[PDB]
């Protein structure tokens, strides 16, 4: 009936390449767990 979601709801918010950086973005994401 129901299960526990996990770290699966993460998508690339845009098409810009970034590396070795922690980037803060606000978008419509699936809440963890």
């Amino acid at each position: 009936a129901y299960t526990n979601s996990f770290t699966r709801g993460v998508y690339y918010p845009d098409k810009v390449f970034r590396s070795s950086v922690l980037h803060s973005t606000q978008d419509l994401f699936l809440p963890f767990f």
Binding site: D14, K15, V16, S19
Partner: protein, 50 residues
Amino acid sequence: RVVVLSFELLHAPATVCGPKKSTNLVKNKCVNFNFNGLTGTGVLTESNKK
């Protein structure tokens, strides 16, 4: 008769571009570049950024 042309700012590879002709590319030199309307000055080099 009204037609409003809505332009969606570049983010992805562009396919509908203006009449500006391209030129050849020169590496390892300070150049004034314009890539699909994105402008700037700098030296263009080879990279390992995947």
